[PDB]
Amino acid sequence: GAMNSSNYAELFNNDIKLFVDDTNVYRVTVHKTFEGNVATKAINGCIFTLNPKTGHLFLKIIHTSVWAGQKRLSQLAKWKTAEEVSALVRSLPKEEQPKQIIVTRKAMLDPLEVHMLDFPNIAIRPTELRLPFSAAMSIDKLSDVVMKATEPQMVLFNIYDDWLDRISSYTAFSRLTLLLRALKTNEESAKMILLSDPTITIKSYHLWPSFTDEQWITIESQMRDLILTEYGRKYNV
């Protein structure tokens, strides 16, 4: 059933699994019309499909053309997400197909279950974790490729850069969720922490700066400080 704090290590075992996050699939700006009514303009979206063990990110870019002449877009978005995830699994060789897909939002369960009826052995699960994957569009290189897309496109990343050379998946996933949580709570402060020192750069083939083990500890500390502060402010405590 549901993935929670109690069954956390299951993410890092040797059963292939994917997290699917649909929170950036359907994106709009809300504006005033000339007649002073409100209208939405859709902007490019993405499906965030992540192997938490390897860090392989299947970033399916959702071009605004997919919504042309469609109704009930927030509902269609869930089914479009399920269709694209289904198409991704079918594109993978049998030994690479996930044994579980964990959706970050319960509204994805029926759309994904119905699209994956051909795969009765793939378990579709919800989670109780509040994962910050909505903040993926605060990563400059992912945001850039989504916004520049002129057509539907699948782009492959490792969201852990080369970390797995030095740390376990468990530690890599905890670093990622702390970075995304920070970016979600206070984007400007988070991004200031990450880039303040211009001597630590981002490699052309990476998403995050090339921090030493010592500099990651300092960065990780600055992200925890950022998150606790913003919480005190949020909640007058």
């Binding site: 399920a82 269709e83 029926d110 759309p111």
Partner: protein
């Protein structure tokens, strides 16, 4: 008018005949039920005074043979049996009628309740859902499981209702996932009506039979089957106008007949709220929606 004689009543028992019921005392000189309307299926059903567990009963049609009840003291129940000797049967029934040892099927002239609950129910279809082909009557009880329940364990003693499953390849066309899941018209009209049931009459006959098994035996899988068959129509955008009009009438008499005290266990809140207020057919069940609102407003 037909008769189901009883050999005897050796154990104290509540006897049901269709929607009527009578208490019979241990060794009370009771010899059966007369004046049973020809033209309808009927169900004769039993709850032992000493075990209000296992309601059980027999679906039958008097046109298909001469049936009687005899208590079996080994298996501990009232058994339906067929008498092949016509003269022996008429001779037995005439004696019991002469001695007035029989209760009269207590139909009120005005009252179309049983016809309205059994309109599309046909004994030949009951015998395909309840497989025991050596008998012309069908045994059902509280505990019998459905073929679909057995998938999710004795096949001989199962209820073979048509399997309905909204998250199945049968229900969902490849490349029409969202369309077929949110509008089940495909599944209703092509798969179930044209493909399996052949016509709406057989579909309504199964629906009505599932309800009566739910109400008379508290058969939980029957209840699931009744709700599934309602939800498949309510969740279809495209239903023939005659089916909608007839569904409203069918459900109105079912809700009318349900014991007030059993609404909590026999009615599924999610299905009824969805069917009356959210579904494509929310505006198409005027009679059903009015009786539900006036009789079970708590459920909604």
């Amino acid at each position: 008018m037909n008769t189901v004689p009883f050999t005897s009543a050796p154990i104290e028992v509540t006897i049901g005949i269709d929607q009527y019921s009578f208490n019979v005392k241990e060794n009370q000189p009771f010899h059966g039920i007369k004046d049973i309307p020809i033209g309808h299926v009927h169900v004769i059903h039993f709850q032992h005074a000493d075990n209000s567990s296992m309601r059980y009963g027999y679906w039958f049609d008097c046109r298909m043979g001469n049936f009687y009840i005899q208590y079996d003291p080994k298996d501990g129940l009232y058994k339906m049996m067929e008498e092949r000797d016509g003269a022996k049967f008429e001779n037995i029934v005439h004696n019991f009628k002469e001695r007035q040892m029989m209760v009269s099927y207590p139909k009120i002239d005005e009252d179309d309740t049983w016809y309205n609950l059994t309109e599309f129910v046909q004994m030949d279809k009951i015998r395909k859902i309840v497989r025991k082909d050596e008998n012309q009557f069908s045994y059902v009880d509280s505990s019998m499981t459905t073929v679909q329940e057995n998938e999710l364990s004795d096949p001989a003693h199962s209820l073979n209702y048509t399997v309905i499953n909204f998250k199945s390849r049968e229900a969902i066309r490849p490349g029409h996932e969202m369309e077929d899941f949110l509008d089940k018209s495909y599944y209703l009209n092509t798969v179930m009506l044209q493909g399996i049931f052949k016509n709406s009459s057989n579909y309504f006959g199964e629906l009505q039979f599932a309800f009566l098994n739910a109400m008379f035996f508290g058969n939980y899988g029957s209840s699931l089957q009744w709700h599934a068959m309602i939800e498949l129509i309510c969740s279809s955008a495209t239903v023939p106008k005659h089916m909608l009009d007839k569904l409203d009438e069918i459900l109105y008499y079912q809700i009318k007949t349900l014991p007030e005290q059993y609404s909590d266990i026999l009615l599924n809140e999610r299905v009824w709220n969805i069917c009356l207020y959210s579904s494509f057919q929310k505006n198409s069940l005027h009679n059903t929606e009015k009786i539900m609102e006036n009789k079970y407003p708590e459920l909604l």
